[PDB]
Design a protein around this ligand. Structure first.
Ligand SMILES: Nc1ncnc2c1ncn2[C@@H]1O[C@H](COP(=O)(O)OP(=O)(O)OP(=O)(O)O)[C@@H](O)[C@H]1O
Ligand SMILES: [Mg+2]
Lengths: 221, 247
């Protein structure tokens, strides 16, 4: 009860937005724009559907592309910690939670189960993807259909189902050559395809230019 | 009384030579061709006797036994010489059954003890095996022969003298089991198929092969629970074929 009053009092502050922006990722130095974009993604928007014909989503997907050593994974870990319903996965492989639905007997419970992908488990939540450029064909197709149609269709072992996958996707990636080239466009610097990139609302580019003062401050931290 | 009346009606059905009938010529051809199976159209029987057709469809085993007895009597009357070779004859069925034309997916317990027609594809087949009908045994110690009929295998005489089996004097009949699966062209998309088991005996053993589309007409029956003090109350259903056709 008093929490609502405290929140309303905090909203009356003139610098509440700046405080919220600075609050995200206390242990990460710099990258104010990244934190602001992540705050905007976390707060989200509002979906619309005039009648039952035109559906417009309200989720803000975020993609970060950066050189090695720029602490891309720390942001994902912090977002996973903060978010109430967050599912973390990596495209390299051997992930705890898969990205494709399948029907199998569970190794532990020894029961016949239908295990959905991380996209379905993150319904009305957040899905974080690390190593976005190492994925295979199945993961790419599943992500494409989950981002365009916002649903997953399964036809396996006599089971035909359609499941909702309303989630916000935050992905991390590295350039093709290991270092971003300003002379080339963003599409040419990433192994991803144009339709996949077009889905993301916010694209962030991180570089590793040698600034002595910034490097000194980072080393001190 | 009912069985005798059914046999009388079945006997009356066959005598059609003075009524532009064909079945007498069919029986003559069967005798000429050394065959012991006759195919009778259900539509003609329904036209001539609707009550008998309804009883046969709703009750198969007794009516089929009566019809086999009638055919035995008819073949005896024609040429008793031929009837000596075979103990009993077998019946085949043909025609349009209508509501009883049932696919493997739509088979239910409502068709128990009835005659059904199914169309499908063959997926599993078994090796041909002999089945005993009669057994003959001989005792070298006493020079005595004994006969047994089947529908316990003796080994010793009354005075515990050993018995030797005469395989040649015994009687065996062929037996095989096949599996019929619903055709994928008609099954609903995205659903697992359903299969039925069929038993073939006598001359119908070698008329089916896996991967082939067939139509089988036969009786639908349950298998009783095997010996035990406790029963689960669930019986397995197996089709007993009487006619197989290559579509
Ligand atoms: N701004 C920063 N503030 C604090 N630590 C930082 C910062 N940038 C990088 N680091 C440190 O750099 C190290 C590199 O590991 P980290 O997992 O963060 O890398 P990454 O950017 O995800 O790299 P990769 O491209 O190999 O996946 C970490 O221990 C992290 O603490
Ligand atoms: Mg990393």
């Amino acid at each position: 009860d008093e929490d609502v009053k405290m929140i309303t009092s905090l909203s009356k502050d003139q610098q509440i937005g700046e405080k919220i922006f600075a609050s995200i990722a206390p242990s990460i130095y710099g990258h104010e724009d990244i934190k602001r974009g992540l705050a905007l993604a976390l707060f989200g928007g509002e979906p619309k559907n005039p009648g039952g014909k035109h559906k417009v989503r309200g989720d803000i997907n975020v993609l970060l592309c950066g050189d090695p050593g720029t602490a891309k994974s720390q942001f994902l870990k912090y977002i996973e910690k903060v978010s109430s319903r967050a599912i973390f996965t990596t495209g390299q492989g051997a992930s705890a939670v898969g990205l494709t639905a399948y029907v199998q007997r569970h190794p532990v419970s020894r029961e016949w189960t239908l295990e959905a992908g991380a996209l379905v488990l993150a319904d009305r939540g957040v899905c974080l993807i690390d190593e976005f450029d190492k994925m295979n064909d199945q993961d790419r197709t599943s992500i494409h259909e989950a981002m365009e149609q916002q649903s997953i269709s399964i036809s396996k072992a006599g089971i035909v189902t359609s499941l909702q996958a309303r989630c916000t996707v935050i992905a991390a990636a590295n350039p093709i050559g290991g270092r971003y080239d300003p002379s080339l466009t963003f599409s040419e610097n990433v192994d991803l395809t144009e339709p996949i990139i077009s889905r993301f609302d916010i694209l962030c580019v991180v570089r590793d230019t040698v600034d002595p003062v910034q490097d000194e401050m980072l080393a001190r931290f | 009384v009912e069985l005798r009346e059914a046999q009388r009606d079945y006997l009356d059905f066959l005598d059609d030579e003075e009524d532009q009938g064909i079945y007498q010529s069919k029986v003559r051809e069967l005798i000429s061709d050394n065959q012991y199976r006759l195919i009778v159209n259900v539509n003609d029987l329904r036209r001539k006797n609707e009550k008998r057709a309804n009883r046969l469809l709703n009750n198969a085993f007794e009516e089929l036994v009566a019809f086999q007895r009638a055919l035995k009597d008819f073949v005896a009357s024609i040429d008793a010489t031929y009837a000596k070779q075979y103990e009993e004859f077998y019946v085949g069925l043909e025609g349009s059954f209508g509501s009883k034309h049932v696919s493997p997916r739509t088979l239910t317990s409502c068709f128990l003890s009835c005659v059904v027609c199914v169309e499908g594809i063959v997926t599993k087949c078994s090796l041909v095996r002999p089945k005993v009908v009669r057994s003959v045994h001989y005792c070298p110690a006493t020079k005595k022969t004994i006969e047994r009929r089947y529908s316990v295998y003796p080994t010793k005489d009354e005075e515990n003298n050993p018995l030797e089996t005469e395989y040649g004097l015994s009687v065996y009949k062929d037996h095989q089991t096949i599996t019929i699966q619903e055709m994928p062209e008609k099954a609903p998309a995205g659903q697992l198929p359903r299969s039925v088991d069929v038993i073939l005996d006598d001359d119908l053993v070698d008329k089916a092969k896996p991967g082939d589309r067939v139509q089988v007409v036969g009786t639908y029956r349950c298998l009783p629970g095997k010996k035990g003090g406790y029963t689960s109350g669930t019986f397995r259903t197996v089709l007993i074929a009487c006619n197989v056709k290559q579509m």
